[PDB]
Design a protein around this ligand. Structure first.
Ligand SMILES: Nc1ncnc2c1ncn2[C@@H]1O[C@H](COP(=O)(O)OP(=O)(O)NP(=O)(O)O)[C@@H](O)[C@H]1O
Ligand SMILES: [Mg+2]
Ligand SMILES: [Mg+2]
Length: 327
C-alpha cells in the first residue's frame, strides 16, 4: 500500500531534508528563557509557560526527558521543515542545560483553552472553522512529506479569542517514504486508525485523517472521546460496533491481513450502525447531512478510501468558512 497523494515528496527532495539522524543542532542560550508555570507534560517531557527575557514575550518551554537522541532530532527536524506553514506551531529556539545537557524546545505561546471546556461551548460554525484550520495544517504537513501521527485535541492549541489554531506536538511525526513499514505504536488509543490496530505497517498520511475524523465525531456528537476503548483490542471492537464487521472483513481481505484469533473473537459480528443513532438533544444543533457526509468519508477502515486533507477542505460542509476567508 502507498499514499494516494504526496508519495514522492521525500523521493524528490535532498536526503538532508529527511535524514533527521544527521541533524546538527545549533544551541541557543538557556538563560534567554525562564519558566513561569507548568502547563502540560508527556511520558517524555514537562511543558511550561515561560518568558523570553529579552523581550518579555510569553513562550513555551518543552523540557525533554532522556530518550534516544534520534527521537529528539526527529521532532526538531520536522518542526524546522514545517516552520512557517499554516497553523503549524513555531519552534523558536533550542537550548540545553550545561551540566545535564537537558534539552528544551522553545515554542511560540498559544493561549489555549482546555478542550474539555472549550468544545461544549463551540457553535456549529466554530466547529467547521476550527476543523478547517486544522485541515490546513495537515494538508500542509502531508504536502511536505510528513505524517503527524498524534492528532488529538491535546495536540491542537486554540486561542479562541484570537480564533488562532496551532497544530502542536510533532514528537511522534515521521517522514513518509513509499513502501516503508512504520511502527504502529503511535497516536493516542482513541485516535488510532484501524491500520494500527491490525498491524498494517505500510500506512501513510491517511492515518491522520482517521484521527481527525475521530476528533470531528466527538465534537458534533459531543462524545469525548467517540471510540472509547480500554486497550488496543478493545479499541478495534469499539470501532467495529459502529462501522460493522462486514467492511472490516472486506478491508482485511483487500490487504491480506489475518486478525489475531483472540482479537477476531472479541470483535465478533456487528451490523453497521447509521450515524444518526448517535443523535440526541445535546448534539442536535450540530449534526446535519453535510456533517454526517463528511464524517462518513473520514471514518473508513480502508485508509485509501478516506478523503485527503485537501479534498476534505473542499467538502460542501466548509463552504461558509471558505466564503468568509475569500472575502
Ligand atoms: N505552544 C504551546 N502553547 C500552549 N500550550 C502548549 C504548547 N505546547 C504544548 N502546550 C501544552 O503542553 C501539553 C503537552 O505538550 P506536548 O508537546 O504535547 O508534550 P508531549 O510530551 O509531546 N505530550 P504527548 O501528547 O503525551 O506526546 C500540550 O497538550 C499543551 O496543553
Ligand atoms: Mg501532546
Ligand atoms: Mg507528543
Amino acid at each position: 500500500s502507498k499514499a494516494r497523494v504526496y508519495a514522492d515528496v521525500n523521493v524528490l527532495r535532498p536526503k538532508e531534508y529527511w535524514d533527521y539522524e544527521a541533524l546538527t543542532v545549533q544551541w541557543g542560550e538557556q538563560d534567554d528563557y525562564e519558566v513561569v508555570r507548568k502547563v502540560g507534560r508527556g511520558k517524555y517531557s514537562e511543558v511550561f509557560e515561560g518568558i523570553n527575557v529579552n523581550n518579555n514575550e510569553k513562550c513555551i518551554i518543552k523540557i525533554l526527558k532522556p530518550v534516544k537522541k534520534k527521537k529528539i532530532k526527529r521532532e526538531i527536524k520536522i518542526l524546522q521543515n514545517l516552520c512557517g506553514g499554516p497553523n503549524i506551531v513555531k519552534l523558536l529556539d533550542i537550548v540545553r542545560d550545561q551540566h545535564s545537557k537537558t534539552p528544551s524546545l522553545i515554542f511560540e505561546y498559544v493561549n489555549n483553552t482546555d478542550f474539555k471546556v472549550l468544545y461544549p461551548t463551540l457553535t456549529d460554525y466554530d466547529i467547521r472553522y476550527y476543523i478547517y484550520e486544522l485541515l490546513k495544517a495537515l494538508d500542509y504537513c502531508h504536502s511536505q512529506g510528513i505524517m503527524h501521527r498524534d492528532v488529538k485535541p491535546h495536540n491542537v492549541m486554540i486561542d479562541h479569542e484570537l480564533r488562532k489554531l496551532r497544530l502542536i506536538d510533532w514528537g511522534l511525526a515521521e517522514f513518509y517514504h513509499p513502501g516503508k513499514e512504520y511502527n504502529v505504536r503511535v497516536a493516542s488509543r482513541y485516535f488510532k486508525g484501524p491500520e494500527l490496530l491490525v498491524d498494517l505497517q505500510d500506512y501513510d498520511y491517511s492515518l491522520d485523517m482517521w484521527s481527525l475524523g475521530c476528533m470531528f465525531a466527538g465534537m458534533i456528537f459531543r462524545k469525548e472521546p467517540f471510540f472509547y476503548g480500554h486497550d488496543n483490542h478493545d479499541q478495534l471492537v469499539k470501532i467495529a460496533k459502529v462501522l460493522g464487521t462486514d467492511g472490516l472483513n472486506v478491508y482485511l481481505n483487500k490487504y491480506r491481513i489475518e486478525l489475531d484469533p483472540q482479537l477476531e473473537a472479541l470483535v465478533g459480528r456487528h451490523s453497521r450502525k447509521p450515524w444518526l443513532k448517535f443523535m440526541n438533544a445535546d448534539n442536535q444543533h450540530l449534526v446535519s447531512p453535510e456533517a454526517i457526509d463528511f464524517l462518513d468519508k473520514l471514518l473508513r477502515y480502508d485508509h485509501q478510501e478516506r478523503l485527503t486533507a485537501l479534498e476534505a477542505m473542499t467538502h460542501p460542509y466548509f463552504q461558509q468558512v471558505r466564503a468568509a476567508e475569500n472575502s
